[PDB]
């Protein structure tokens, strides 16, 4: 577990139908919301991968049990025991596959959330600080164009650093 | 000024199991166990033979119900419930081995034994129990030998079939077990009866036994069937005194095919690789809970109604 | 002025294996492989029958050891080592299929065949090998038919059993293989012996074979047993002239139950769903290393003494 | 692995017994030890979830007579089949435990890290990490202030101006 | 003024599969599926017997090909293709059980039955079909009994083998099925032949099946074999009238060995625990794709050419 | 999954052949590279751990089908069905084994990279800042011996803190 999705982020946003992860900002101009295409595609691609590995090339089996006529009792008992043993193995394997796959899928999605968070944190450098809940309090005036530059991964921290640091200390 | 990170969620989540949690809610999920089948035998792309009410064994001996299926070629052979093997009452030694050989085959050819009998033998015995064209008849690949003069001793007789082919042939014969002394005497005479059969790889003796027993299709006597494989170049000889039901043709099983026992009608416009008594299973899922008895290339049977695979993150509603 | 984060640890930790380390120390771990089990047959909640020294086949033919086990109902049938099937020497054709059918049943009823024999047949043959009250007797569900007048030809005889019931019945008969020509002649006469049996679905013929062989229970004769199922509404007819050990009752196997082969003593105070030769296995654990041969609802057998599943964190004690 | 347990945390505390994870502190008043309930239960609940899957539980009959001879060829087929089934279960049992143990250890490591990270974002600019799992706090923090850190009630902005002066001088 | 962290990469990575990605490039990988075996039977450390062209059944009855394999001790027994079991036409009833018993054994001892025959019997029957050192001979462990005086009735005869040992013995006998009534009368007389065999646990009757007409047809002379186990303390008795091929020795299977069928040359320098038709498999890998048919302590067969296990991190080249 | 390898680290270093993880530095005297022993060993020990589990053997099996002679058709069919079922199980288990193992191996290596990064970041404390691509910009002259002290985990931050803080602030 990576601490984000059912962790320090209080809840999901049902209003974000645009993608799996994303931004909400608040500046003097107003509020707004955008989905991050890169992190969502990284998660979706891994899901796709697990589904591609699910849907195996198979062995040809023939009948060893007559549907319409009786089978000798001893051999039929051997066959019953064998098929039931095989089915117990596959039932167990199927349950385990899905339980294990599911744990990994949930933790992978948590990881992709955290990596986005961490990428934005390093990008903001000393111009911002974290609240506990997954927001960044930005200590300069951040334009709608400035906001877009934080999502766009093009934001230049050195350009706002003087202003931000003054506000952080004062 | 502030920028916030988050993930999506939905109002209606789906529950999945994990290693640590039976009841985990995620944004989306899909089934990994197939529960629905197709109620048809999907035969497109297969040279299939639907036997109808003809039982696989009946193809070798030529029971009237199998007249359309005495020879052929197929990669898929379909047996139906209450198929008919025997018109005259009786049974076959090692019958499920024989049925399974026929059901993995890719066809059957028939070859004359060339057996001829002298003037003391009537080889055209027929019965009300085997009707063919509104007339009393008999298994098409066999001949019921009886004394031409009723009550007279059936003559000592020797018949040999030679396999001059390059593949093994399957040969079947029957032993008549009459239901009374009077019947046995009329057909074969009062002498002691003895039938011996031998090849390079088979030797056996049979004696017709008279015995009271219930009527089946109106008849108390029985014909028991036997079979063996005659290898290329080898010969099989019958020495008999009366009571032999002699092969007039032998079979050759050709190639390989998939045997299916099923209730479902044929759909020659649908394709499939997996079959069961109900029909076909066409799925990309690795597991199924339709039936533990399937043939072909199938998903594995599992004892579960449902197994949901998560395809989304934990769902955390507002 | 500082605050520190930490986890616990313990003085004595336990070793488990992981994907990367066969010697990983952790705060706690628990077993996943049952190794103990109970050396008794936990029969609480089961209507069981302990056959004791009675073999399941003996129930059908009525060997003296099985006189208290000729009928009954059960959900669990217990078979013991060296149980007795045959008082007279012999064997049963297709015996293991028949034993497995009985060991799967949930009971047996007996039904009279109603067979009757003409005056020149003595139907009350007995032997010192099957004793009741310390005297000569015979299988309870069968009759040793011989010529009443010694040395005379046993008459040609027919007997038919009719199944008027709605379930299949199991009929058993024997064939006597005498020890000598003289014995054969005295019991059945000098004629050739032939027994034929036929139903709608079954047909067979048997010939008594005179042969020297070693004595078992003092006897060189044998009675071999045969059996077949008679379907509802079908009849089975015996045609015979000497050598038939004829059934006076047929059996009906009823419902299902679990068959157990074990010599462990029975315990009526504990319950269980899993059994083996040495007793019962009562565990929530998914694996066991007690036995590869079990019956009922059992943990899967594994080739390991112990598999510890970590139930805590890595154990990092103070240096 | 998340880097805390057997990582940057030198070792575990034997003296902690009311939880799996907890706080040690030192201030003017002295030192104190309190376990953390919420992180301790997150871990334990996941363990009991695995244990439940473990004890979730087909009727088999006998196919091998204990007391009488079995036909030799079919007896060999049964032995081969049973031994093959047993190789499969033995392998599956070894894999289950190994894979489960791996995960359990790393999940425990994870809950430690998550508690550490919760406190870090809580303390904000009033403290600095020493790299051994401790937060050097740059203001005076009495026993009620310490409890304020454990109950997730610590308001950083209350000590911020004083803390920053001490961090900068 | 900077310090950078990083990881190695390589020029040529290896492609492996993961749960989420086929074609994941990694810095190094090793194979988990053994695809190469040794085309030799590595027998170092094994007391073995290579039977050559002697079939295991031939060891018990003493076919000339098996003269050097009538007894012995081994922990490994190696059977070859087309090995010889019989020198005279015929076959063994229940043969595959018997062969598996022999191929599971750790050796064989022979014990004389002690059988002797009255003056009316010639026990030295031989045949040009079983040549030994250029002379007409017979199975070394059996005796062909015929009437001393041709055409006269073979006497009623009894022979009893007593197992006075502490372990079960395996006794084999043969039944001669003559080629014609004329041959049957010359060997054994005009009477009805009957062979009865009985122990405490076994009884059976055999009646020779007399063939017919030319020697080249299917029903000619053969000798078929039967076997049973004789428990410690038990006696087995033969009563016979003509047609018995009697045992002059019985066998005793000892201990356990590993049975191998292969035509691969033996190598004594080379140690192994796993074998197939084509040789040995010596690998630490847990899977193999050489053959679904192996014996010994073997890696599990899998239907995969290759399964690569990552031994390095993701390979991310510049 | 841990965000470092094929994450915020742009690429690997083919030039580093003495270890899996390491350090490149930049000061007035020039450039250097060294491998980090402990973290590469931590990673190699876990790999070799897995290889040991892999090659871990076993049950002795005998033959149940004859190579050189025929066997009865019905039991032959049962043996075929059973052997093909067993093989499908092992083939599936073999494929799952390495898919799962490989996923874990890749993420474990990512994790060891991250923990090295985190170790260094904590050491430097307030004397350095992250550039977001795996480098620490240090705010004091750091000569070859000072670089060694960082890689050797004996860098004393308080020795440079004064200078570092006023360079970060100006
Ligand atoms: C199984 O065994 C059963 C007992 O033998 C067989 O049932 C019998 O088959 C015969 C011949 O078909 C029937 O015989 C005839 O009976 C009628 C008169 O029937 C009426 O009167 C009788 C006597 O009171 C009464 O029991 C009946 O229910 C009728 O009301 C005569 O006119 C004929 O000449 C001839 O004697 C038997 O009736 C019949 N029994 C029954 C109950 O059906 C049965 O055939 C055997 N099954 C097999 C598979 O062979
Ligand atoms: C037929 C008869 O009485 N013959 C005399 C033999 O009994 C006698 O030999 C002894 O036979 C003993 C076995 O006797 C019984 C038995 O208990 O098994 C006596 C039964 O009444 C008889 N029952 C029937 C239905 O025949 C039974 C049966 O005939 C046989 O089992 C068939 O084998 O035999 C016992 O084996 C003694 O060891 C044996 O000496 C001989 C010698 O006295 O003389 C006969 O006239
Ligand atoms: C009894 C006899 O000698 N009769 C003469 C026949 O041998 C002969 O036919 C030829 O028989 C040949 C086989 O002869 C042996 C054998 O198999 O080698 C000779 C053995 O001594 C004899 N041994 C015994 C125990 O009897 C043996 C045996 O009887 C048979 O194998 C049983 O079938 O036969 C061979 O098959 C030739 O192809 C065949 O012509 C006929 C014709 O010459 O005359 C008989 O007097
Ligand atoms: C070859 C031959 O004999 N065909 C006969 C046939 C056989 O003799 C018979 O099947 C041997 O049992 O019998 C046919 O008659 C059967 C007929 O016999 C009557 O006597 C009886 O009363 C009827 O119930 C009925 O069984 C037959 O068709 O089977 C005639 C055939 O020509
Ligand atoms: C096998 O036959 C021998 C003799 O044919 C039987 O042994 C005799 O047994 C009795 C009592 O057990 C002894 O008094 C004799 O001394 C034994 N004879 C010898 C010479 O040892 C033996 O009982 C038979 N086995 C079976 C099972 O019938
Ligand atoms: C085997 O089990 C199936 C499932 O109930 C049942 O149809 C069948 O009768 C059993 N067969 C035998 C060998 O008795
Ligand atoms: C749910 O998953 C299936 C397959 O992964 C996919 O077809 C579907 O689009 C998903 N539904 C949603 C809500 O995205
Ligand atoms: C079969 O009969 C033919 C013709 O008599 C003969 O050529 C051939 O040898 C016989 N086959 C065998 C194997 O005896």
XYZ file of C-alpha atoms in Angstrom, chain A:
170
model
C 0.000 0.000 0.000
C 1.205 3.469 -0.982
C -0.842 5.691 1.324
C -2.765 7.785 -1.199
C -6.054 6.425 -2.589
C -7.757 5.239 0.587
C -5.183 7.000 2.720
C -4.282 10.685 2.958
C -6.585 11.481 0.045
C -9.957 11.563 1.837
C -12.050 10.357 -1.103
C -12.384 10.074 -4.854
C -14.033 12.619 -7.112
C -17.177 11.231 -8.805
C -17.180 14.413 -10.882
C -13.998 13.406 -12.668
C -15.266 11.392 -15.615
C -12.381 12.741 -17.663
C -9.837 10.170 -16.405
C -8.515 8.185 -13.428
C -6.297 10.803 -11.784
C -6.307 14.582 -12.006
C -6.016 18.130 -10.721
C -8.330 20.573 -8.989
C -7.016 24.113 -8.550
C -8.133 27.267 -6.786
C -6.816 30.720 -7.734
C -8.197 34.296 -7.689
C -9.656 33.680 -11.159
C -11.719 30.742 -9.864
C -11.805 26.945 -9.412
C -11.259 24.281 -12.094
C -10.547 20.592 -12.780
C -8.447 18.559 -15.191
C -7.485 14.906 -15.608
C -3.879 13.798 -16.074
C -3.705 11.665 -19.232
C -0.236 10.174 -18.608
C -0.808 8.635 -15.189
C -4.302 7.367 -16.138
C -2.939 5.665 -19.278
C -0.123 4.070 -17.257
C -2.719 2.458 -14.981
C -5.136 1.491 -17.795
C -2.286 -0.060 -19.835
C -1.378 -2.281 -16.897
C -5.036 -3.329 -16.481
C -5.214 -4.143 -20.202
C -2.046 -6.177 -19.763
C -3.597 -8.345 -17.016
C -6.720 -8.867 -19.142
C -4.619 -9.909 -22.160
C -2.993 -12.446 -19.859
C -6.304 -14.126 -18.864
C -7.767 -14.704 -22.296
C -4.288 -19.056 -22.981
C -3.872 -21.546 -25.797
C -5.469 -24.907 -25.075
C -4.961 -28.710 -25.147
C -7.545 -30.945 -26.934
C -9.360 -33.266 -24.494
C -11.468 -36.289 -25.356
C -14.299 -37.934 -23.419
C -13.466 -40.510 -20.761
C -17.013 -40.587 -19.342
C -19.978 -41.839 -21.298
C -22.955 -39.476 -21.045
C -25.480 -42.062 -22.279
C -24.297 -45.483 -21.088
C -22.950 -46.896 -17.866
C -19.227 -47.074 -17.156
C -17.681 -49.957 -15.141
C -17.904 -49.119 -11.451
C -14.266 -49.271 -10.342
C -12.871 -47.308 -13.312
C -15.737 -44.808 -12.971
C -14.767 -44.277 -9.314
C -11.141 -43.708 -10.343
C -12.275 -41.190 -12.963
C -14.596 -39.446 -10.462
C -11.820 -39.065 -7.919
C -9.375 -37.759 -10.561
C -11.703 -35.220 -12.161
C -12.781 -33.972 -8.736
C -9.167 -33.635 -7.676
C -8.378 -31.697 -10.884
C -11.393 -29.436 -10.331
C -10.364 -28.760 -6.712
C -6.938 -27.641 -8.031
C -8.439 -25.336 -10.669
C -11.032 -23.918 -8.248
C -8.265 -23.062 -5.800
C -6.037 -21.643 -8.540
C -8.849 -19.520 -9.904
C -9.684 -18.080 -6.478
C -5.990 -17.371 -5.796
C -5.373 -15.811 -9.246
C -8.138 -13.282 -8.772
C -7.424 -12.555 -5.063
C -3.717 -11.908 -5.850
C -4.333 -10.061 -9.111
C -6.889 -7.840 -7.340
C -4.517 -6.927 -4.536
C -1.900 -5.935 -7.056
C -4.322 -3.947 -9.222
C -5.532 -1.891 -6.209
C -1.934 -1.259 -5.071
C -0.766 -0.425 -8.590
C -3.512 2.177 -8.905
C -2.479 3.602 -5.506
C 1.133 3.755 -6.678
C 0.244 5.648 -9.898
C -1.634 8.207 -7.794
C 1.368 8.704 -5.491
C 3.813 9.026 -8.417
C 1.730 11.840 -9.878
C 1.629 13.553 -6.468
C 5.401 13.152 -6.105
C 6.088 14.457 -9.620
C 4.088 17.617 -8.901
C 5.756 18.007 -5.504
C 9.288 17.973 -6.943
C 8.172 20.283 -9.747
C 6.911 22.898 -7.249
C 10.235 22.670 -5.365
C 10.335 25.444 -2.698
C 7.390 27.441 -4.053
C 4.789 25.330 -2.271
C 4.032 23.262 0.825
C 1.837 20.200 1.497
C -1.282 19.981 3.580
C -1.981 16.470 4.838
C -4.858 15.903 2.391
C -3.103 15.878 -1.010
C -3.258 19.594 -1.806
C -0.321 21.918 -2.496
C -0.608 25.448 -1.033
C 1.200 27.583 -3.631
C 2.908 30.704 -2.203
C 2.721 32.979 -5.225
C -0.048 34.151 -7.529
C -0.635 31.199 -9.821
C -2.261 32.156 -13.133
C -4.733 29.890 -15.000
C -1.845 29.654 -17.492
C 0.509 28.992 -14.528
C -1.823 26.208 -13.346
C -1.854 24.675 -16.790
C 1.945 24.745 -16.665
C 1.939 22.666 -13.487
C -0.268 19.975 -15.112
C 1.613 20.308 -18.406
C 4.881 19.594 -16.557
C 6.426 22.792 -17.970
C 6.379 24.962 -14.770
C 9.672 26.775 -14.058
C 10.143 27.076 -10.302
C 13.087 29.514 -10.464
C 10.779 32.089 -12.083
C 8.582 32.370 -8.950
C 11.019 31.393 -6.204
C 11.843 34.830 -4.801
C 8.198 35.770 -4.414
C 7.247 32.366 -3.002
C 10.054 32.209 -0.439
C 9.278 35.705 0.807
C 5.669 34.674 1.392
C 6.672 31.385 3.045
C 8.872 33.127 5.617
C 6.765 36.286 6.115
